[PDB]
């Protein structure tokens, strides 16, 4: 029966018809209520960085390597070596990343939760995770599951003869499914799962470059592309176009793409020994006896020669437990014919080739060379073919590219270098790490901070509104999924941010010139002290908030943490930063949504990426309005006669029943507030403004700040949230 | 159009297919992640009791009374008085309560959130809540919405000539929709919304007492019953049967039921002036312009003479703003004919009666007497008729019953009287308050506690397992939804708890005799220090936990909070306490699930009622197993060779891959753990045990406790959780 409904209707533990069932279009605050400290079994104060740095890292790697060849009878090792399986585990963990929204990736260890634990493409990776569990058990909280799944892959490569660039730990574990990711709207998995992302187009060559943004896989439940070919059609040329699209959506270019696929498929094999009808439910659907595993295979013991994962039965090289150039040799030198695997799937077998590909359980049995459609892709696109042919001839260039791309794969969502832990962090800085320079000079102190705040506030062209607006515009580029963005680097002053329409470029230029004047007056006049433009942008907003609170009758300390540095344009890639450009910004009343993402939904999504709770989101919006900090200085949402004073007037006026709110535009984005007694139009509001008086949970918070006498609490809460947001990217600061 | 699916599929803020869509039968931990401190805009520190006790209570009441007759143009008051509307608001807030499971009621102020804010039976209570908001805005955090909604009703009665018994404040606000309540499984509201709860029966008399347990309303979206009769059939006798059933499920008897209905319907009127097609979406479905209101009526201004709420147009009495006996006088003395309201609903009108029922907006217009089918029910049932006839002749008896029943309605989920705040708490002790006496003698001090711990741990018939088991058995009766149960009162020693099968009465009796011996030896030999059995039960389990920790190699001070009292059997009504009897208790490995709720779902439900987080639930279960604290003393789940020592052995052995787990019972409730090397059956487990190694988020926590070196953390976490559970009902310590 029906999608998303259990046949048995529970009457316990949340069972029954729910609010989101009745009103499924209503804004949900779920994404702001994930990952809370109380839900974390290690405690909200657990410091993973401190724990990992005490880890006996060399012993961990030695233990992983030993485990690679300790075959467990419940899931025997192919060729006596789990290396391939472990590499696949790590690649699948990291491989969900989408560059555009920065979600997916290995950094939260989400493979161990729903839905990723049960995606078809992750079949039998439950066995891989269970095999490495003893390492986690031994070393405890000093290595996270997130770090372990990836380190295991890295160690596996090295112990199969491929030296990597190194590794960085530092991924703190998470403790619930991340239900904030848009993986797609399809209600089916691969082999279906993609009508929506191709908008019902089935012309596989024509549609390949039309995959729905921000998605990076060609079906729901896949990592990147379909190994049988697009929609299971065994056409390598069309497969290549899907690969370029999907890898492009994960942030990889042609060279990196070939290197990753040719590199990975040096190792191990696929599994398609028996038909899929022999395979039981995925882990989330499996019975208690499976104890977190799934896909139980009822043929023989369900494992060893009977392994069934993808349905394909391909062994790429003659030495699947050792690095080689066998993949490209076979790919290019064989002639290929289309055959079926034992499970009935499309794959390719060498015509008149050698019968010397080894069987994983019988030293006396051999097979012909085989390839996936998605491997043949690499010789059925002009650019992939050029690259493949070059690396056939010069396998050392493949090894170099693969080491670099593999490091990128594993660390693309780890954030800045200051987050990377351990004794073998690669020394080279790569553009995808959004590199920052080491700091200039002696750090400014409290007395320097006080002098600079006063200098900033007395500078021509700087006022409270512009300072707060500018600081927030910088800060809200942060996203916690891939730990990119934020104020460190002062990238608002660089391309593309300085030209973002949402930053009001002409205004921003004047503000930045003013702050650069403050900088020039200070630097070289305070001994060895120097201040960055990044610190000044943040300090400016912070001084503005402090002054705005004082102007509202509240003397409060507004914390400031110095030490940001300024990035160079060379350290600031235009494409990578283009992904951080907002289409709507509720903190500064910029832009609007579209049919599939309303303005207020975009705001809540951004709030989740800033780790804000509903009260934090609410207080920040209300304070930005009081400060008059809209991107263009408009009065939209500015429901106060004391703009620039930090009061809860936004909320008080929003909930005043003498104001009637009506739509002005056709699109529902603009609203007018009319005084019911006088009949005069008093206010203009956006959806980002009015949602706080509509949504019942947000309105409950709006009410708190609208209560008589809450001027002081509002200020304290605002300053706390402001501080949190300004410091999100401060990984350089510990404890 | 599909139920529970939005026509437009958002791609932000949680948009996209979710884990619960793919695997809707999987256990969800959502109910353990509600009401988190981080989500409370008042802060986790906030002490509502302190705030309320500083409230100018008499001033709030004076302002409410004044509001009643200050008609607002946007929602004009009937007869110039909002009293009736406010009484309905309070009644509906309190009126969702179910005695069996203790959910619903006014104690969380949930009417202001989904789904209650948008149930059809709460139509236009959005206006009522908006009308009282200025009181909340004036007094701020010193009165909660939860308290204010009910106090407003109470004040309304008193200002319309009906003196109540008084009032108790103390309901702290909540900050999200409580999605833990089972309101039913239907996918429609009233006029439908009841196929499931009557298992498709439309035999209205025969089905009336077969309403699905634990439901207490005859359709989804109703408070109790359908005012037009069962499934809109205007049959008063069949309506009576629904009313007895629904009110009985809300914990009200016949006298109480007639008192509440005839009491309530002394006041105000219903609204059915225009057809339902003129009425817009409910609040959760309304556009932003409605700013949290809904049911916009497009006829005229939508209000005053055009008010449309239920579709009925009944004015029960000739003085709807003043207490009278006119309801019963009309009901009994008139001859009733079935007619249609202007909106097309069935109601009753008096045939050749007086034409003196006043119009709510025109002092010069009068109408005939009218009644609902649900009112005529009260003279179309033999027991109700006798009560109605008596109170027609003896109106003082109705007044007395109504005062008492109204007090019970409003306070039934407030908990022990130690929670009740304000200057007019009624002095009478009522059985539904689960009353407790004053203490005997002087409070034991730490010297006494040390002596008592030593005695308890060297007394015939007591040991670690039994002591821990007994304390938890007493503790888990607590439920946060109506603040009932817990260890205070030692009600495990009284009927009905002492003979609950889940308490293993023969073992319990031996444990209690032994504790009573300890009590006898202490009492009357330590001057005037006296210790209660309640304290000894908790102290015994606490001492046992502490010793078990010590035996495991961890020295920890397990805190104990003295001062519980022992309830009397007179204050412990067998029926009142039958409602707390558990179907299953995973903490002590008792019981089995039902067709509609698996054992593990019942456990998570109970955990929610104990306010436990997932880590707290997990640690408690593993510790109870290590302690050998099963209700029957069995080894099911006792995955340890060191029973009685507080180790994480439960987790270490649960996750040992050398153990294979298989179903033993046809009912799905029993499991066997076989050593795969030896082939020996090693363990036996229940669903409550094995879920911790199956569910991905619970198993993630199980793994923490199974990690090498976490023996101390396990004990520390257990002791914190133990302390939390033991003290849940200690409202006397907050007082
Ligand atoms: C277009 C991209 C890719 C596709 C469609 C693809 C497809 C597949 C499939 C279908 C399997 C077999 C799963 C099974 O039946 O057991 C597999 C195995 C594997 N892939 Fe990929 N792959 C891709 C890219 C990569 C990348 C980037 C890496 C690593 C850098 C990688 C490394 C592996 C390894 C090591 C295995 C072997 C697992 C084992 O021995 O158990 N692949 N791949
Ligand atoms: C069988 C139980 C009950 C049923 C079916 C019922 C039904 C109704 C309905 C249909 C309305 C009209 C809503 C509208 O159109 O505005 C109403 C109004 C009202 N009921 Fe009840 N009722 C019940 C019990 C109670 C109880 C227990 C109380 C209070 C103790 C109460 C007090 C009120 C009041 C004060 C109003 C008037 C609201 C106003 O003047 O705006 N009722 N009832």
From Swiss-Prot, chains A, B:
The Gene Ontology terms for molecular function here are: catalase activity; heme binding; metal ion binding
- Annotated EC: 1.11.1.21
What are its GO biological-process terms? cellular response to hydrogen peroxide; hydrogen peroxide catabolic process
Q: Which family does it belong to?
A: Belongs to the peroxidase family. Peroxidase/catalase subfamily.
Cellular component GO terms, alphabetically? Answer: cytosol; extracellular region
Where are glycans found on this sequence? 199, 253, 335, 352, 523
User: Which cell locations does it reside in?
Assistant: Secreted
* Cofactor binding notes: Binds 1 heme b (iron(II)-protoporphyrin IX) group per monomer.
Q: How does it assemble?
A: Homodimer; disulfide-linked.
Name the chain's protein: Catalase-peroxidase 2
